[PDB]
Amino acid sequence: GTILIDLSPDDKEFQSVEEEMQSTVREHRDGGHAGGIFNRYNILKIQKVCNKKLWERYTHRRKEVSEENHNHANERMLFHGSPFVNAIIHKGFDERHAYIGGMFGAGIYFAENSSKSNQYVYGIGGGTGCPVHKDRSCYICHRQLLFCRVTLGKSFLQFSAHSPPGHHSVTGRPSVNGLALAEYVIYRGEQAYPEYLITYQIMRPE
Ligand SMILES: Oc1nc(-c2ccc(C(F)(F)F)cc2)nc2c1CSCC2
Ligand SMILES: [Zn+2]
């Protein structure tokens, strides 16, 4: 049921998505090993992902959460990077998209930093990089990220499966790298919706 609608660069909705993509790039502690070396992106395309079934799956769960949490879904817009982008946009988030080895357990991980998600585009740890050149820092090959609507509800704070009892998600607060943004984990696929498919290249710094 999924339809992808291209957004014009002239569209204010394209511009705010791009600004969040570009402005949440940071440097990574791996010196760019997993994700490549870059400070910014070349945005090639932004699409609205539209699927009535999967939206309604998302909002049904959102209401359940919100009623458990004084009418507060605690809804975020967060980045997701995966080798399974295509299956996510077509079938929705489920168990097969979980980062089994994640630091907060087997669940689906999301980042405030677009550049953190970028590290998972070609697999955990960047895998072996792009399929064409086997280059984790490929400046030529087209990448895709999801910009997702995420329901956090009451989130368990971790300074650094099931959500912890009485909670709907886990928040990873960075506690060493002063410039890192938060990372989040949900344990039910129904708590995220892939609103935007972003296609891009990482840009070689001058
Ligand atoms: O955007 C992200 N994606 C993944 C991720 C995606 C897919 C997979 C797998 F291939 F399914 F196993 C594993 C991990 N992990 C994280 C983030 C951003 S927050 C840091 C953790
Ligand atoms: Zn490549």
From Swiss-Prot:
Residues 8-206 form the PARP catalytic domain. Ubiquitinated at 'Lys-48' and 'Lys-63' by RNF146 when auto-poly-ADP-ribosylated; this leads to degradation. Deubiquitinated by USP25; leading to stabilization. ADP-ribosylated (-auto). Poly-ADP-ribosylated protein is recognized by RNF146, followed by ubiquitination. It is found in: Cytoplasm; Golgi apparatus membrane; Nucleus; Chromosome, Telomere. Highly expressed in placenta, skeletal muscle, liver, brain, kidney, heart, thymus, spinal cord, lung, peripheral blood leukocytes, pancreas, lymph nodes, spleen, prostate, testis, ovary, small intestine, colon, mammary gland, breast and breast carcinoma, and in common-type meningioma. Highly expressed in fetal liver, heart and brain. Zn(2+) binds at residues 130, 133, 138, 141. It comes from the Eukaryota. Oligomerizes and associates with TNKS. Interacts with the cytoplasmic domain of LNPEP/Otase in SLC2A4/GLUT4-vesicles. Binds to the N-terminus of Grb14 and TRF1 with its ankyrin repeat region. Interacts with HIF1AN. Interacts with RNF146; this interaction leads to ubiquitination and proteasomal degradation. Interacts with NUMA1. Poly-ADP-ribosyltransferase involved in various processes such as Wnt signaling pathway, telomere length and vesicle trafficking. Acts as an activator of the Wnt signaling pathway by mediating poly-ADP-ribosylation of AXIN1 and AXIN2, 2 key components of the beta-catenin destruction complex: poly-ADP-ribosylated target proteins are recognized by RNF146, which mediates their ubiquitination and subsequent degradation. Also mediates poly-ADP-ribosylation of BLZF1 and CASC3, followed by recruitment of RNF146 and subsequent ubiquitination. Belongs to the ARTD/PARP family. This is Poly [ADP-ribose] polymerase tankyrase-2. It comes from Homo sapiens (Human). The chain holds residues 952 to 1161 of 1166 of the full protein.
